[PDB]
Design a protein around this ligand. Structure first.
Ligand SMILES: Nc1nc2[nH]c(S)nc2c(=O)[nH]1
Ligand SMILES: Nc1nc2[nH]c(S)nc2c(=O)[nH]1
Ligand SMILES: Nc1nc2[nH]c(S)nc2c(=O)[nH]1
Ligand SMILES: Nc1nc2[nH]c(S)nc2c(=O)[nH]1
Ligand SMILES: Nc1nc2[nH]c(S)nc2c(=O)[nH]1
Ligand SMILES: Nc1nc2[nH]c(S)nc2c(=O)[nH]1
Ligand SMILES: Nc1nc2[nH]c(S)nc2c(=O)[nH]1
Ligand SMILES: Nc1nc2[nH]c(S)nc2c(=O)[nH]1
Lengths: 118, 118, 118, 118, 118, 118, 118, 118
């Protein structure tokens, strides 16, 4: 099927298991992939016939910026829940990246990806 | 099966739902992936036996540069339509990236991917 | 000489010459370089003896997100003028990047750099 | 299902078939992908209900830093073995990258990916 | 199953449909992905029990550097043919990238991927 | 001092010493740096008081896409000479990159930088 | 003049002004530039006649990983002071990057550069 | 002033202090910068009136791939010394990067820069 892909949505947040993570918070990066039939929207060229990526980005960002979760799993589940509330969506993958996570090791990124589908 | 992959085709355009997007326009980036049997072309080493990526790039670019669509969904559908008119193609994915989209949030990219297959 | 370097401060703003740019705004990316003697701060290990990079980032961001200017020159000069209130500062160089500027050509970046010094 | 993705874990090691590789060693880069149901952890927001990426990174790094293997296949199998010892994990992919491998040719990366599943 | 991934193998060549491409030639970039069971090699830690990526890189590079093909399809088929001559290999994908291809448009990369499997 | 920095202007052209380079042409990448007093423009916020970066990009691109030169030195000098018609300009530095230049060695970039000043 | 350039030395540390930063620490990235006459070393091809970049990296890393400082200025000055014990060194410039610094704004990097010279 | 800039010339070599480095060798990356008056070449558009960047790349590569030196200082000085045979050259700066150098710390790059001038 077709898909809408949002990549690199960068939002300051305070999610974290440990107290020290919630004093000042850190950078979070969100990807969203939405599986949805896009044929109708190419016929109508009407935004109402697709899933608006402007609303998706603002909603995703507000969740990330909101009151902190312990787990990024829970942040990703809240974003995925939002996407599936649109009955046209077949499936969604939400990647919550925590690239500044406190890990004593040298690494590029750590993330969870929450998948949902009908 | 085999595939031809065009990546990062960068073309100025004016697509957009909102009037202000069509005054000066913005950068669009296209990826095309074509699924097609390539064994015959390796036997003949004859360009006529494969899907010419030179024609693909020019056709994709002309569509993107053409009169604006409201939706990038519609741009991607027009490119995908072109590819499937070649009876040898099994499937195609066209990614239309709108990395400068007007979104109040900080993000790397937003795109739609239009998939077609036999 | 000693310097403090802030790179890639990313802030949504509405600066621009043309009406179409004030509707939704666009991404701005700020670099600041501050020339300042840092020996005292290294001797004391006291934040008071250096220029706090948090103050540097937060104030520059407030300017960028604030009242729209027509020119990025004007934004850079405001940031630079405020930095030189700190009498310990020898010179400052503010780069205001407008990577999304509406230009019909394909390019990576456009920016102005404002310098001020004692 | 859901997944946890660790990327770019960078650890000095001495793995290698050839003696000269084990005198000083070289840079290794590890990716780990873990397939696991994350719904319960979003309900509880309890780290105990997910696979802790802090422990994963330290365990992966200790293996890579440990006494050398001849093959990076064997390093990847040891990491994958560790992940599957958690009964909640459905599958895992461990990529062991050896980007400095002694190869007379110019190349970006060489890696093995060890996959396991129930 | 498991896989060996070679990425970014960079080799000067002269492949091309058009005469002017074969006077001086251009940069080619090869990726190879090999699907093969790696469990035995982790048990033995014996290079003889896996597919040696040193030989793969040299063989791939020699093909690319060899007498020119008209099509990169044909270069990729020759590399893939080589890999499948090892009876242990389940499948292979060879990506031949021609990032400097003569295309009047602005683009990041163009490539063909030749897939083979048992 | 104050400057305007255009980076990565990307334009197809046919410059080159050898016949084979004039058949299809290749990618050129232009940087321009203009040294100019920007205080007045920041005071007035009037585009007329600075060097318009649109004029900078469009004119440089027209030169690059125009009559082929044998040397990139000649292209850079043309761009630089035209920029110094603006008497407010202290100096200009034009880098003409030829990233795709036919060289048998593997390299990232080759470029010439032309400077002019009062 | 002649110089030795170490870039991107990556070391976990616990420097920072705030208590929350000393709990788990964060990534620090060091650059060192050493101005030194290298003609003798090129004449002799003797490591003793130059500044050994292994000594440069290992000692800088030991400082970064060592007792936590409040300011990165203090870290940079320690590295620089120790480098100038070598009387052959004309000048040294140490950049201490704190890419993960807790700042509420979105930014790429923050760093201080300490310079010392005869 | 005017200059010619070659960046990222990539050549396998066997330079190094330690025996283990001469067995298989490693990647070296060369930059050359040549300060030279380019007005005449832009006037004539004659390759003879400038420094040919093909000669620059091919000769530097031959040195890098040639007899192994213990120090990268020695390699850089050889490249620089040969460049200054051209009496039109004001100065040259050769950077020899050893990105794969055996250092136990994690780092991006290590290099020496050799300068020569009239
Ligand atoms: N999978 C997972 N592991 C974690 N460890 C810590 S601390 N925080 C987390 C987290 O948010 N998710
Ligand atoms: N999916 C989608 N959403 C949009 N929102 C706006 S504005 N424009 C678009 C668009 O072109 N596609
Ligand atoms: N130097 C300069 N030129 C411009 N052209 C436009 S439009 N906007 C600008 C600008 O903000 N600065
Ligand atoms: N597949 C594979 N091939 C190799 N060649 C050498 S040397 N070392 C290796 C290795 O660790 N894995
Ligand atoms: N698919 C494909 N199309 C091409 N066009 C030209 S020219 N050369 C090629 C080629 O090698 N492969
Ligand atoms: N400096 C310089 N050298 C060249 N060699 C060739 S071919 N073309 C050029 C060129 O355009 N400039
Ligand atoms: N210049 C400077 N400013 C800072 N602000 C904080 S918090 N930490 C620092 C620091 O380490 N250096
Ligand atoms: N300056 C410098 N230091 C080194 N240490 C080793 S080992 N090799 C080198 C070298 O080639 N140059």
């Amino acid at each position: 099927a077709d898909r809408i892909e949002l990549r690199g949505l960068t939002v300051h947040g305070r999610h974290g298991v440990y107290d020290h993570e919630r004093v000042a918070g850190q950078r979070f990066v969100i990807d969203v992939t939405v599986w949805i039939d896009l044929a109708e929207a190419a016929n109508s060229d009407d935004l109402a016939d697709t899933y608006d990526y402007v609303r998706l980005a603002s909603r995703a960002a507000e969740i990330v910026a909101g009151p902190p979760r312990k787990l990024i799993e829970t942040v990703g589940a809240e974003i995925a829940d939002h996407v599936m509330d649109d009955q046209r969506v077949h499936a969604v993958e939400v990647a919550v990246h925590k690239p500044q996570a406190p890990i004593p090791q040298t690494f590029d990124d750590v993330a969870v990806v929450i998948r949902r589908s009908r």
